[PDB]
Amino acid sequence: KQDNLVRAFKALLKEERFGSQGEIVEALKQEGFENINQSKVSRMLTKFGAVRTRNAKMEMVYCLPTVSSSLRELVLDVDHNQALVVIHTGPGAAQLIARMLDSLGKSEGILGVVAGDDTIFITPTLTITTEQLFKSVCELFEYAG
Amino acid sequence: KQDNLVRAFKALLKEERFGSQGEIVEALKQEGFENINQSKVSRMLTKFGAVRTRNAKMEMVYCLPTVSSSLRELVLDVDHNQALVVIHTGPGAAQLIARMLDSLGKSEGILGVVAGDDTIFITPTLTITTEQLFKSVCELFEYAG
Amino acid sequence: KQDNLVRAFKALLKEERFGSQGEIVEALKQEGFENINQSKVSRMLTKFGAVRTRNAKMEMVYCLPTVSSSLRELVLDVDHNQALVVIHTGPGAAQLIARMLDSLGKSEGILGVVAGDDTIFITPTLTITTEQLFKSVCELFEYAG
Amino acid sequence: KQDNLVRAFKALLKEERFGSQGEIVEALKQEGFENINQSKVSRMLTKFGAVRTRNAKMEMVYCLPTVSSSLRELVLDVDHNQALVVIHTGPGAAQLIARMLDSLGKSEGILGVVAGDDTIFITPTLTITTEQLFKSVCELFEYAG
Amino acid sequence: KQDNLVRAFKALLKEERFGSQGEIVEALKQEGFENINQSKVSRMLTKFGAVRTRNAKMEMVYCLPTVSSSLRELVLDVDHNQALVVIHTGPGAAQLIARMLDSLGKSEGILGVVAGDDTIFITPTLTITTEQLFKSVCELFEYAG
Amino acid sequence: KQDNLVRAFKALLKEERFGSQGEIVEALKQEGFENINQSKVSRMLTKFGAVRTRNAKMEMVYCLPTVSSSLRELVLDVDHNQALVVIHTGPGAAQLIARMLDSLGKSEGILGVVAGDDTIFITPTLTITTEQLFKSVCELFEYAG
């Protein structure tokens, strides 16, 4: 079952047409993996070295290979809660991406950004909503969050 | 007075029976250290190299010694506020523990995790309360928070 | 225009009389730079290696030069939102300053602190307001936030 | 072929009897994977989340699962060149292990230690050879280097 | 004089034709800046946010702008001594690039890699010379070292 | 015995007259602690929060207290071997100090610098000896290495 899930997952990446973690979860559920969830999908994206790429249809999508990869291609997910916008990236890319985001600053609604190895926390200024900040970050990275 | 506090503190660790920072504070107050607080206790746990261990009564407790220590044994405190679950660890162990926590993912209520040297911030998904996340994290680390 | 902005900005630093990012923004607007904002000012403080110093009038102010610099002199801004107190520092100084802040602990209203390269997130305990924590942090660093 | 290599590799881990990267390479070559090398084995140990464990025969060996893991169990390889002893660990464990090693100090032949995410560089004092330091580090971690 | 040096330096970047730090130093000396050296050039590349790009003549060269930048474009210099290959990168990009290099492994002559914020140390295996490793790293990043 | 060693050690710090780890080791040996060594002294400097200060006799010496501390005051030891100059600092100060050192660059004999939490590795260019680099670093930090 696990070998089949890995094969199915990699095939979705090879199609170069899925743009978000939720899309991958839904595709796998439709294939029969009833217990699939975002936690499992996030672990697989990290484990198998998935990155994003702009396909020939101009869509930012996951793919399976990274010296020529761009920072934007290193973003794997953008999500949020009431207080923070959280980005997940490929291993060790969070710091580099956070450097760029914290340069955008308060005028763009970013009060501050802190990154871990593959996770970034973006906190908003009092003048922008977490949802608007979320929408702006999704636009910057072309992620269908 | 400070020499006596250190001696008293180390003795509490040697008893291998205290399970939380608050328990240590209370024990020291009862001994006569009226001005003791969690800030002082946290500094002492860090300074004296305290770690936790499962005692022979099956209780996770502080002890005074660490190549054979486990990640769980490296957690010193778990607490929270309205927006985050915060974990304090032994020096330089936060990154390693955060790697594990962020692998649990959204399906377990963890939207993201970021760590500093000995501090970890865990932010919840919109589908779990900070208190429930707190309770789950306390269960994972067997910490009486 | 950009060359003039840089010259104007550096001159403000050389005056050794401005104590906050907002003061710099206002001074530049008054000089005719209508589009100046905190994002631009934050980038310039980082780019030109600005630090703070206590001037001869006993005021903590920005200056243009750092082996003899103190941690307090490495703080560039202190601001906050509803959930966090955020500090911006000179490049690579956040970790060191965060070490000090997280030692203050819960008894001082600091539940935890995590730092990125030049940004620090301070989360409050349930017993202190974000504004009171903000005011205390501003006092510690003598920053007119 | 790659699916077969992964299956073969995981099976070696499940046997809980291999103690070093070189042993894994040799076992895979004997099975028919003529092009296997340490670079590939190191990538697989990282990718599949391998850790070490003391088996029932008292041997430190690789296994396939980590909250209960010890620092020693997080070491994947110990090797050296003329100037440094280099340790590879599981993801994000290098910092924690380095903290311990740099505490051993000059009296134990360790002039200094610096760690990356999963790599540690140990430089020797002028009073110990890189090979003796290597042998001591291998003994500490019970690694057949 | 400093304002003229900055203007001259930025103009060299805008030409999009210089491939190494030494080339920049030589060009500036020829323009009349007799005291220019690599230390000053390295500081300027960092300060002004220089990155590399493949120009229309297929040459990897410095340019003056970075969300769409690749890891290779983030390398600013490759040099070496008798024991290490050292890479300098744009701010906060060293960790990400090191992750990639340490994946190449021992079979490619890389015993280990450790990174700081914008500096990477690559130590060779006993089977490759520091100069051959240097030459291979220069080829990977297309840097005329 | 350990309580006496701690008391003796702290008293040496309070004298504000010792300038190097070796001086502390020698003073403790003279007091009767026959088994004292640099490993133990380094651990104590870290554990007890020692920093350096310029005393009234203009000597850089250890002291026992740090928001007003300078980067230079955060250096605890400077030593070297055949290939590297290694600096030990107070907890979490290595990154900040390394940022400054790597800005000095190749023209000052510094090929590169990488830091861990409280340790810094400085590798020399082919044009400066490790001993000359050592002597220059000792002069910069006024450390009697």
Swiss-Prot record, chains A, B, C, D, E, F:
Function: Regulates arginine biosynthesis genes.
Pathway(s) where this gene product acts: Amino-acid biosynthesis; L-arginine biosynthesis [regulation]
UniProt protein name: Arginine repressor
Entry superkingdom: Bacteria
Pfam families linked to this entry: Arg_repressor (PF01316), Arg_repressor_C (PF02863)
Principal location listed in the UniProt entry: cytoplasm
GO cellular component, one term: cytoplasm
Family membership: Belongs to the ArgR family.
Molecular function GO terms recorded: arginine binding; DNA binding; DNA-binding transcription factor activity
Species of origin: Vibrio vulnificus (strain YJ016)
Cell compartment(s), UniProt: Cytoplasm
Gene Ontology BP terms: L-arginine biosynthetic process; protein complex oligomerization; regulation of arginine biosynthetic process
Keyword list, A-Z: Amino-acid biosynthesis, Arginine biosynthesis, Cytoplasm, DNA-binding, Repressor, Transcription, Transcription regulation
Entry annotated with the keyword NAD: no
Gene3D superfamilies referenced in this protein's UniProt entry, alphabetically: 3.30.1360.40, Winged helix-like DNA-binding domain superfamily/Winged helix DNA-binding domain
Family annotation (InterPro entries): Arg_repress, Arg_repress_C, Arg_repress_C_sf, Arg_repress_DNA-bd, WH-like_DNA-bd_sf, WH_DNA-bd_sf
